[PDB]
């Protein structure tokens with residue numbers, strides 16, 4: 001029973017079917033000026049359309065990347081560098097993925113002033129802080145749509161309203177697309193990170209959606225692909241796969257999200273019956289696929305080992321920067337179990353988890369001095 | 370008949386077979402601490418071994434990237450930035466791919482002094498220039514192993530000797546691996562770009578091999594993968610495919626190279642019978658898969674169109690910076706046809722090309738005032 005979807009997902013068989021022809025048969029480079037090139041370009045442009053449509057992205061452009069990490073790098077560094085004339089102040093949430101944080105820290109070394117937005121006890125960003133700290137020289141705010149460790153969905157719509165078309169809003173939607181509604185017009189995104197494998201597409205590809213008129217400096221330099229923003233010969237098969245994932249997700253996500261929530265809730269209801277167990281992240285304003293719980297006296301790493309031995313795959317997330325931002329102590333943060341659900345989980349998988357986990361927790365507790 | 374291998378190659382069916390299990394079945398993230406993670410990590414480490422062995426790379430490390438473009442960016446920018454204490458002077462060949470040139474131009478904007486190494490009429494770099502221009506503050510030299518436009522193989526072994534362990538030598542081996550012997554110890558490389566699809570692996574992955582003790586700044590920041598040098602969750606299927614490509618290439622390349630040369634030579638011998646035709650690049654110190662010819666009075670773009678209409682795919686390479694570096698006039702550079710061979714070409718494909726091309730050239734000539 002696999003409960004580590006936010007670490008990696010299987011490729012849907014339907015996505016693999018759409019991709020394969022482009023590996024072997026129709027293997028042209030979209031820049032080539034012959035029939036194989038034309039077919040490759042048509043495939044890319046069609047994929048690009050499927051990704052944009054997913055997120056209601058007609059008011060911007062999709063730029064293909066090698067994944068969410070490279071897309072977040074592009075968003076942070078590419079926007080800040082290009083727009084530094086307008087100011088060098090950036091607000092970044094304290095619970096962003098390291099592919100936003102580490103680029104932000106790089107900007108700090110380059111003379112930008114990066115201020116981290118605090119979160120409350122459930123990991124929600126403090127919107128009043130953003131409002132108080134926004135300045136004339138604030139050029140960029142980066143707040144994830146939802147947190148993939150603790151499940152908390154962020155108040156991106158209210159953040160957009162605060163910014164009032166004064167600073168660009170970058171939203172990392174790695175955790176949200178396919179789980180909750182991601183409509184760039186509703187959420188007021190100026191840049192949106194999208195991950196292919198998080199929607200059961202292939203690994204090794206992703207996108208940054210960029211609102212019309214937002215200008216970025218490329219990071220990956222070369223032959224000028226992606227209208228200059230991201231060079232390198234297009235990975236057509238992965239692009240096709242991601243597009244096919246985006247079209248399936250558009251069709252299926254609402255149903256899937258409701259199924260995940262059903263499973264999720266069964267887990268949370270039962271796990272929280274264990275003594276001295278505590279849910280991390282908001283209990284309600286929470287991604288449908290996320291269960292993050294901590295247990296007093298126990299090491300999360302030991303829970304994951306013990307579960308692995310029983311044929312159940314899970315995660316434990318220096319302790320997590322997200323957990324520390326929420327105000328947990330080192331020892332609380334250390335007792336964490338992350339269970340993340342996905343397309344292939346069944347009721348039987350949940351049954352198994354719920355039968356095995358209480359005994360696991362009971363042995364580990366017995367070991368604690 | 371497809372003669373545009375240096376734009377894109379098919380994935381070998383044997384490579385696809387090795388990859389597929391990792392898409393759907395064994396889809397773990399190598400950083401996960403459970404059985405699916407362990408299998409994924411074992412696959413990655415095994416691939417990494419197959420790539421290193423291909424190039425005799427035991428004296429260094431393979432860093433996985435999204436392709437040759439990203440690997441060249443890493444080599445140029447990552448090395449120069451990390452090593453700038455030692456000097457800010459860089460020598461780059463005039464005929465390097467734009468994924469080296471454009472990073473070099475970026476360094477020039479950042480205060481590095483980049484000097485372009487000239488080439489002679491066949492596109493060979495001027496080694497005496499490197500020797501004359503090397504200084505105490507020269508930290509990096511980037512010279513491709515061979516040129517993928519004109520086929521010319523570069524005197525990398527003699528360049529290594531010139532440098533005398535004074536400056537790092539970056540060799541872009543996109544064009545050479547699988548075509549000619551690429552042994553990092555023989556050629557004295559400190560960093561080597563390797564492209565997966567150029568060896569019939571999947572698109573969207575590649576590597577920079579880095580000699581032990583050479584230090585680089587990462588460009589793609591995030592979760593710390595690739596020992597900190599290139600963050601992002603590993604694209605296991607593509608990595609596996611690239612490894613499988615590297616193991617096949619190690620086994621098969623000498624044979625394949627001799628077959629390509631046979632085909633290549635048949636083409637060159639016959640094409641050069643056409644009046645007022647001229648080979649670009651060296652006639653002998655030349656990649657086995659490359660035929661680059663120009664025709665007086667004719668537009669290469671028209672030759673490619675006409676060939677496309679006959680079911681033959683080829684290339685024409687502002688005119689090519691490589692051709693201009695070799696001293697061609699605008700009108701000469703504009704009459705170029707590039708035919709690049711590969712694993713699936715047959716004698717029948719060559720027959721077809723040789724039957725069709727003389728008529729193509731005759732019509733186009735008729736149109737010239």
Ligand SMILES: Cc1ncc(COP(=O)(O)O)c(CN)c1O
Nearest residue numbers: 232233436437438466517543544
């Ligand atoms: C010599 C060479 N180097 C680098 C690259 C960059 O390759 P890619 O577009 O596969 O990233 C190319 C393009 N084939 C090339 O010919």
Ligand SMILES: Cc1ncc(COP(=O)(O)O)c(CN)c1O
Nearest residue numbers: 067068069097148174175601602
């Ligand atoms: C919210 C979020 N954002 C960005 C990423 C970076 O993703 P990747 O490692 O697929 O490039 C991750 C890792 N899953 C994440 O959870």
Ligand SMILES: [Ca+2]
Nearest residue numbers: 165166213214
């Ligand atoms: Ca604006």
Ligand SMILES: [Ca+2]
Nearest residue numbers: 534535582583
């Ligand atoms: Ca040295």
Ligand SMILES: [Cl-]
Nearest residue numbers: 120121122124
């Ligand atoms: Cl909160």
Ligand SMILES: [Cl-]
Nearest residue numbers: 489490491493
């Ligand atoms: Cl020469």
